[PDB]
Ligand binder design. Structure first.
Ligand SMILES: N[C@@H](CCC(=O)N[C@@H](CS)C(=O)NCC(=O)O)C(=O)O
Ligand SMILES: N[C@@H](CCC(=O)N[C@@H](CS)C(=O)NCC(=O)O)C(=O)O
Lengths: 221, 218
């Protein structure tokens, strides 16, 4: 059997969402690291796989699947032993899709608006409005957490997506525990997963440390 | 019937309008004026804690978020799956495109427009305009076929066109740099319901942003 290949970078939040999902599904990924600093994502071959030139990208026996949310849905749909991680039911699926688009359109987008300029454009200071954009995202997430998980009272791929970015950005933009108790309670649930630290926690800590290090290098230049 | 809590100038609302027209559905549109904070009432927070439009009410079934709404409508009301495939591989291509729209096209549109519309902004910072230019290039490269995914119309087209048609009225989209985007726009514009469901609101929102920008400068 052809083993699954993930074009990936462990410090990348969307890549870690897929790693979490693969662990939950009992899948083993062959990880191929893609160095963005040396433009490994901008080779002709990579751009052929993904014209938007982002990681993660999955190669499943020749079938190329781009984009973390799409990859997770694909993996649950194809390999899941049940639909617990991503419901096939019309209404619950719609709740999950809404949450996944909140992650791409709000959580990750705003994370990137803060981190990208530091990592790729010599940024040495985070503009106040962009930090506040993230604070606003924390509040939106806090209000989304009406139940134990992002959607309902059991773990789903919406949790993997949201935690991958929240765990990263909270190491750069302070997330006040007195303001957002539900986010921290939810993080605690996810941290109890045996695969959480290896699939996500480690890389979330690593990326925040890298962002802060680069920001300081840039400031001290 | 089908109720949409909506604002015609809003790109994600117009994506749903396009989708409903394609499905032959009639929406009862209930306007929510974001400018006067009608989205921040307790009742609206009840339907959607993230306080955004669009929200669909389908005989009491509440569905938030434009992409989720379109998938829901096609799944429940489509005569077939043309607009959103149930097949594993094509569905994944569609999902990737929909998340490109939310995470890149709409996010960057909002990063330009929101400060002007809601925060008294009178400027578009160079870096944010450039962020949109980069989005145009990403879209141009995504268009390897006649539509966003494949060679027939899907909800990924509705999502992407709703935001592209809006932001191009604020951040110039050079036809010499982006010929494929223009070719694709023409395919969407040829739909008999395009102007009513999307084109009009796209023009209105661009005018709104430019007008407010100048008012704020005074
Ligand atoms: N919506 C995408 C976002 C992917 C993304 O932006 N990945 C970043 C790494 S965190 C990347 O590859 N950037 C390279 C580039 O944008 O050129 C997903 O969830 O897969
Ligand atoms: N991903 C959401 C985005 C919705 C969204 O941001 N809508 C804007 C109008 S264009 C809004 O309701 N803003 C009000 C707010 O953020 O409080 C979707 O596609 O439905």
């Amino acid at each position: 059997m052809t083993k699954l290949i993930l074009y990936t970078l462990h410090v990348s939040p969307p890549c870690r969402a897929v790693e979490l999902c693969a662990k939950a599904l009992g899948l083993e990924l062959e990880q191929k690291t893609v160095n963005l600093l040396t433009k490994e994502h901008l080779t002709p071959e990579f751009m052929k796989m993904n014209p938007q030139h982002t990681v993660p990208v999955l190669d499943d026996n020749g079938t190329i699947v781009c984009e973390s949310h799409a990859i997770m849905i694909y993996l649950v749909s194809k390999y899941g032993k049940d639909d617990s991680l991503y419901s096939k039911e019309l209404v619950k699926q719609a709740k999950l899709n809404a949450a996944l688009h909140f992650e791409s359109g709000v959580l990750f987008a705003r994370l990137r608006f803060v981190c990208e300029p530091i990592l790729f454009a010599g940024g040495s200071e985070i503009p106040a409005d962009r930090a506040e954009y993230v604070q606003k995202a924390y509040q939106l997430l806090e209000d989304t957490l009406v139940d134990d998980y992002i959607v309902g009272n059991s773990l789903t791929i919406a949790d993997f997506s949201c935690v991958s970015s929240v765990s990263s950005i909270m190491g750069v933009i302070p997330m006040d525990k007195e303001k957002f108790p539900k986010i921290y309670g939810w993080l605690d649930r996810l941290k109890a997963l045996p695969y959480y630290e290896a699939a996500n926690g480690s890389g979330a800590e690593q990326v925040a440390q890298f962002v802060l290090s680069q920001k300081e290098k840039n400031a001290q230049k």
